[PDB]
Write a protein that binds this DNA or RNA. Structure first.
Ligand SMILES: Nc1nc2c(ncn2[C@@H]2O[C@H](COP(=O)(O)OP(=O)(O)NP(=O)(O)O)[C@@H](O)[C@H]2O)c(=O)[nH]1
Ligand SMILES: [Mg+2]
Ligand SMILES: [Mg+2]
Ligand SMILES: [Mg+2]
Ligand SMILES: [Mg+2]
Ligand SMILES: [Mg+2]
Length: 321
RNA sequence: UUUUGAUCAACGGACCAAGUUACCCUAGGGAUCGCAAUCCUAUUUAAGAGUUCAUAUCGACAAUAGGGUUUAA
């Protein structure tokens, strides 16, 4: 849902000398909102990504003025954010019936002025519909987010046995007895830092920006997880999780977030729970500023223990804001 | 006792005569492609730059098809 498109403005019609007058302005490119299903159409159908607008009509005998040209339109999903090639946000078609002048039609060719014709503007426009979920799930690889989403919903999420798996976020809506549906999306496990875009990087991290709230899975196996070389403590992971989010965007840290303990079934994990209870809250032997929302609940996937309790806490936060 | 006379130029030249008709009439006949000169475009060129985990090409200059313009009552 993060495609890209190129467009070209129509050319200006050439003027008719001997009092004929101005030529028509070139056609303009307006990205037009349509049914949200159109997103698949744009990226997949019409593989050629160049969209061109009709050039302005040339002046005709009897000193007819230009026809102003023929505009071209690009269907887009609702809620999409229109951004420039450099990443500048031109606009977002948040609601339907929303058109944006992404490209400018060529200035109408006027014989009296300096320029007889003028060519239409052309540019690369990035179009992305980063998942605007009610809340987002953020965790390290092998955290269990896919397993956690598997139990709450029936989305058959891909289970990441190894790191760098489940690259594409999977949107799952959680039903409640109150008949309220809350969308939860599971992204792939993130690496430490990633401010330099190491490994996976923060390219997929743009999706969380849209999400109103963040869900932090805390794998107890994560505590001192090998991570290949060094072994990282869970307390360290939380600090790094907060630190890396702040580096990518300050607002991300300020946004509401929740904590989700995972893999507490193991008796050794239960011993760690007291370590998790000890870590944070009371000052620890620290090894940037970090933020603790305190919305942490002890649960285990696979065994499906305590899952129902967490659901209530998530709903309370959503209802609050 | 030898000669001269025309924008008679409608130029084989009436000495000297314009409009108008739906108010009309008669006799009839009828019908009932080229060059150039720039400028746009489209396809094939690509000189170039390019490019970067549901992520890119555009495009000099040409070639070719169209549409204009200057170029001839
Ligand atoms: N003991 C235990 N094992 C679990 C639990 N949750 C997941 N696992 C195991 O850990 C494996 C790793 O996959 P998992 O962490 O679920 O995938 P993911 O959450 O999508 N990983 P990623 O963080 O990269 O997105 C699973 O296939 C499963 O065998 C849990 O609560 N307890
Ligand atoms: Mg005559
Ligand atoms: Mg004669
Ligand atoms: Mg003769
Ligand atoms: Mg009358
Ligand atoms: Mg009368």
């Amino acid at each position: 849902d993060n495609l890209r498109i190129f467009t070209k403005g129509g050319s200006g019609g050439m003027g008719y000398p001997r009092l004929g007058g101005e030529g028509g302005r070139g056609g303009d490119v307006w990205v037009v909102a349509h049914k949200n299903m159109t997103l698949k159409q744009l990226k997949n159908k019409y593989p050629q990504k160049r969209f061109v607008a009709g050039g302005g009509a040339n002046s005709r005998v009897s000193a007819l003025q230009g026809s102003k040209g023929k505009d071209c339109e690009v269907p887009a999903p609702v809620g999409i954010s229109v951004t420039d090639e450099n990443g500048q946000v031109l606009g977002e078609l948040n609601k339907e019936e929303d058109r944006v002048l992404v490209a400018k039609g060529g200035l109408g060719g006027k014989l009296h002025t300096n320029f007889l014709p003028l060519k239409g503007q052309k540019r690369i426009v990035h179009l992305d519909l980063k998942v605007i979920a009610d809340v987002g799930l953020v965790g390290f690889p092998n955290a269990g987010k896919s397993s956690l989403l598997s139990r709450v919903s029936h989305a058959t999420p891909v289970i990441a046995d190894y790191a760098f798996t489940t690259l594409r976020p999977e949107l799952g809506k959680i039903m409640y007895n109150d008949f309220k549906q809350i969308s939860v999306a599971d992204l792939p496990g993130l690496i430490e830092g990633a401010h330099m875009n190491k490994g996976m990087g923060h390219k997929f991290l743009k999706h969380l920006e849209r999400t109103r709230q963040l869900l932090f899975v805390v794998d107890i196996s994560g505590f001192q997880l090998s991570s290949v070389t060094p072994y990282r403590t869970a307390f360290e992971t939380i600090i790094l999780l907060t630190k890396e989010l702040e580096l990518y965007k300050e607002e991300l840290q300020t946004k509401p977030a929740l904590l989700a303990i995972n893999k507490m079934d193991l008796p050794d994990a239960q011993v760690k729970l007291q370590e998790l209870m000890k870590q944070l809250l009371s000052p620890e032997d620290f090894l940037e500023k970090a933020l603790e929302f305190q919305h942490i609940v002890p649960i285990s996937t696979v065994t499906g223990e305590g899952i129902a309790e967490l659901k209530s806490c998530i709903r309370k936060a959503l209802d609050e804001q």
